[PDB]
Ligand binder design. Structure first.
Ligand SMILES: O=P(O)(O)Oc1c2c(c(O)c3c1[C@H]1C[C@@H]3c3cc4c(cc31)[C@H]1C[C@@H]4c3ccccc31)[C@H]1C[C@@H]2c2cc3c(cc21)[C@H]1C[C@@H]3c2ccccc21
Lengths: 532, 532
């Protein structure tokens, strides 16, 4: 298996024509997305709408929230399907995901990209690397890893034969996916299902349109009923309900630190009722760095930092939000960042393929980011160098913002904003070693980080100092854009449990192996020779 | 790597003479075992004694409980040693464990066996398969698996080089080991240390002599100071102290389900203070079955069941405590079980090598078993077929006991006794399929189980029905005695987290990987061609 090729979308290309046609097919249209339990389309009275972030007057989907009753019905029906699905050979379960991957690659590529663009506000290329490439790669690579895992078998010595059976977990898994990557929903529900689990999938409200498209592709690729239940819901009620079920065996979560910790506390509070110990997997965010040494390639620093900080509006757990620059290069880097900043286009990504990034996802995010832009004006240690405006009249539009902090410990250097807000700290060149320690100590997070240096001694030094500051560490590249099979993704500290989805070990969280020993000769006496 | 050969200890063998000399060397002697922080031997006033279970007048060791101050000092010192240990190449960490394995195999074998016999009440062969064979195997196999893991590396695609660094966990690990296997303490503390972690090891009070011998061998094999701190303590105080530390990164536990669930709840209660999400690993109890089909080899049922139920007094999480026999074979199996029962010798294992098993571990365990034996003689559905008496006047001596239940759901069929008490349910031959379901549905546990059948269709059928009733499932063999590398050990339901120590994946719980991407060419423009 190889990584899915990323298409260029050149003027006149078939993929660009297909994508423009799929975008035109969504304009002025709304889909009614039901909850799905088995093959039943279920509607509750608690109706919700998804809107286009860059045109929030456009309702792109109507959906509804599952309540406690419907969620418990979905649990019961999933559990009643699990034994059969777990006994289905892994090669057969894998084939469904490989067929879904082929559909996303070819005939459904334009649709899944367009729904991710219109529903989540992604540009062409951000939709392509997510909803096509990453999702396709998770499905094909996890399928490869799961079939290869069957070959990891114990030793046999006469008179016995040993084997390992890679059972799914007994119970159901709750998959809770974020707004910002179509692919992550596919993986959070898909990887456990591949390993013989049954799943209640609560997709993100602001990603409904594309998340349901992923669900329908999996069902059309042959996923049986009751293996993944499609159950949008209020976050607290979903959490309360799954953590109250005696049958919970896992939570596969991506999102905020506090929500993950809350779910962990709810499981522990109910620990005496579960039939087994639930497995919690959480990817929980970052306050990621780009650290520049005075020997750096300045144009690589500028391009890589502008992409890491501002693509998809900085709405990535991997996005650079703290830049460390030596005094000697600062005038040059500042000049270049301010030059390029003025050439960044923010607008409608469906209508204008010149757009670098579009609106942030929703009103709540827009209000949080606006509070940070107010903080950057109201704080004595902060100076806005570029941007600072926002406008919610049409979409949730925030200009890319570059903020200089005179204080390396300022809250803007520590708290995850999840918006297009880059904080810069200028350090004395002769204090680069002290500044590496500041990079390591300043925040609670451990997710991504980059060092830009042509000086290999500084790279070797920075690599050692920052060993636990970043689970995905980059040398002379940007902190975003991990590729399945190339950079397995995750980190520790407050960033989560670090199960490295995108690598071969992630699937091991979703199997509880059994070992069988068969003895081929009679056993003989209970006593031992030495006892006689 | 091969499994350590199990020696026979027959009259005239070198290992029988060497063991008798080592036993002689312990008779009427006591060791003063300190807490060890770094290389410092530390005493508190909270002195404790380990006694021989078969002769509870004989103190074999004096030790002491670490107080809160000493545990906190142990944590700080371990943390200060962690970075250099984590950076030591895995080949160099492994060589320490391989040297320890060589010492245990050769010059320290008789000592570690004799300390396990006198201190924990094991017979020769139970000491040999534990303190020698299984511990040596853990050390050699985990070393092999850790060096193999290093070779699991991601795909590099120009212009970038990718690598995985198998970092130890950032923080300290608490290892909490049980009385019943010397080897398990070695693995619980040793496997995390192999993977670049630092450890506070709280060994079991009633295994202190042999646990300290393991610790000293590791230090003499080259383990640096402050990698494993030897800190016997009160169980509750140890748990409180380590779960209150913001630096806790893991608990490696073997013991009771209530203690494991308490620790899990304490970690969740403190989750906001930890620098990262602690990893909890728990092996707990079983209520393990031997299921007999009417086609079974009766003599293999009899010998396998007597060994599984009664070796080491049934003090194994894997021990058979429920036997399911078809009516057509019951007169035969009952007669053979009662004849062999009468031939079982219980006595002093050091003085009489004819002993099948000796006293149970301590007064608390004796009292629990005596309470169950009272239940067995005072319950409407139960009858005692053999045994039923106990005597604590010299040692904690319990006769092997066979109980028949007419009720397959009786408490004695469900609850883990951890003593030499076998419960038998006789089922109608034509209800063998309903009885397979009862095996699966009766208890809360999922650890070990066996089917005895020469009918290969019934073996297939039982394998499917009992898929989640046992994590270690045996076909025509007894339910105890897993061998490292051959039967990776563990199970789910209430039996724990099922991380399969003894197999290749267990060490993955003790690493938090980092992935490095190094890009060798400049990054180019931040814009994309399709945007022009
Ligand atoms: O249930 P209680 O503890 O109020 O009373 C005693 C009983 C009995 C008994 O011998 C005692 C008690 C009191 C006095 C004696 C005893 C002995 C003990 C304890 C309480 C009691 C504490 C310390 C010791 C013990 C062992 C295991 C769990 C709890 C304890 C009989 C009669 C009764 C009893 C209950 C049971 C059983 C047997 C009995 C079985 C099935 C159930 C049980 C629980 C835990 C282990 C074993 C059993």
């Amino acid at each position: 298996v190889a990584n899915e090729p990323v298409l260029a979308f050149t003027q006149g290309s078939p993929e660009r024509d297909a994508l423009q046609k799929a975008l035109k097919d969504l304009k002025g249209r709304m889909e009614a997305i039901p909850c799905v339990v088995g093959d039943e389309e279920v509607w509750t009275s608690d109706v919700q709408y998804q809107v286009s972030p860059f045109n929030h007057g456009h309702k792109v989907a109507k959906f509804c929230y599952a309540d406690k009753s419907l969620l418990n019905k979905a649990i019961e029906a999933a559990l009643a399907a699990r034994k059969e699905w777990d006994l289905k050979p892994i090669a057969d379960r894998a084939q469904i995901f490989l067929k879904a991957a082929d559909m996303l690659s070819g005939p459904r590529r334009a649709e899944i990209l367009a729904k991710t663009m219109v529903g989540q506000g992604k540009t062409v290329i951000q939709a392509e690397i997510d909803a096509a490439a990453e999702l396709i790669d998770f499905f094909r690579f996890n399928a490869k890893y799961a079939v290869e895992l069957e070959g990891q078998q114990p030793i046999s010595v006469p008179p016995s034969t040993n084997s390992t059976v890679y059972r799914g977990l007994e119970g159901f898994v709750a998959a809770i996916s974020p707004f910002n990557f179509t692919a992550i929903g596919g993986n959070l529900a898909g990887a456990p299902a591949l390993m013989g689990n049954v799943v209640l999938w609560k997709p993100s409200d602001t990603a409904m349109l594309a998340s349901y498209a992923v669900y329908r592709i999996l069902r059309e690729a042959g996923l049986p009923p009751n293996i993944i239940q499609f159950v949008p819901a209020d976050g607290p009620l979903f959490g309360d309900t799954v953590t109250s079920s005696e049958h919970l065996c896992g939570i596969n979560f991506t999102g905020s630190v506090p929500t993950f910790k809350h779910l962990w506390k709810q499981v522990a509070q109910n620990l005496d009722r579960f039939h087994t110990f639930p497995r919690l997997a959480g990817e929980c965010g970052g306050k990621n760095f780009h650290f520049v040494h005075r020997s750096a390639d300045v144009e690589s620093v500028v391009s890589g930092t502008l992409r890491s900080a501002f693509e998809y509006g900085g709405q990535k757990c991997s996005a650079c939000s703290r830049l460390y620059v030596p005094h000697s290069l600062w005038p040059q880097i500042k000049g270049r960042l301010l030059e390029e900043h003025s050439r960044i286009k923010v607008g409608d990504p469906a209508e204008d393929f010149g757009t670098f990034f579009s609106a942030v996802i929703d009103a709540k995010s827009f209000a949080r980011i606006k509070k940070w832009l107010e903080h950057a004006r109201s704080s004595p240690s902060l100076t806005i160098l570029a941007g600072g405006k926002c406008d919610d009249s049409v979409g949730y539009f925030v200009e890319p913002c570059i903020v200089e902090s005179k204080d390396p410990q300022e809250p803007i250097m520590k708290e995850e904003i999840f918006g297009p807000v880059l904080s810069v700290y200028v350090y004395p060149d002769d204090k680069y070693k002290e500044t590496l320690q500041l990079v390591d100590s300043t925040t609670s997070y451990g997710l991504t980080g980059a060092v830009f240096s042509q000086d290999k001694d500084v790279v070797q030094e920075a690599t050692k100092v920052l060993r636990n500051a970043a689970g995905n560490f980059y040398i002379n590249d940007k902190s975003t854009g991990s590729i399945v099979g190339q950079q397995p993704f995750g980190g520790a500290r407050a960033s989560g449990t670090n199960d490295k989805p995108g690598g071969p070990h992630y699937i091991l969280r979703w199997t509880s192996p059994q070992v069988i020993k068969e003895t081929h000769k009679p056993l003989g006496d209970w006593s031992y020779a030495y006892m006689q």
